[PDB]
Design a protein around this nucleic acid. Structure first.
Length: 108
DNA sequence: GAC
């Protein structure tokens, strides 16, 4: 399992994809995940939510026509989800936020 | 796009 900021940032930079322990919300939902129940670790052991589109509506991240942003959970082990997310663009800019997309730091 |  790889779910730390540096670990995921390195993997993303090297392989241009999230490591195997990530599943999208749709995939998680298909497995029986119910947000209000905080049951992810029970329906998908050792998995973290990741890979969904981040719309960047606040414009806090660098924007450019045709650039798509995606986000993935970081530091998730169990229970309800946290505030830690890695943000990555189609052109491989990588950012982190620890406050649920309120502020971001460039890390790769 | 924690819920």
């Amino acid at each position: 399992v790889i779910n730390t900021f540096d670990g995921v940032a390195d993997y993303l930079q090297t392989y241009h994809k999230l490591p195997d322990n990530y599943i999208t919300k749709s995939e998680a939902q298909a497995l029986g995940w119910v947000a209000s129940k905080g049951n992810l670790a029970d329906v998908a052991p050792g998995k973290s939510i990741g890979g969904d589109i981040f719309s960047n509506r606040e414009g806090k991240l660098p924007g450019k026509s045709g650039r798509t942003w995606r986000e993935a959970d970081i530091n998730y082990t169990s229970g309800f989800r946290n505030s830690d997310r890695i943000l990555y663009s189609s052109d491989w800019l990588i950012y982190k936020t620890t406050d649920h997309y309120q502020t971001f730091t460039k890390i790769r």
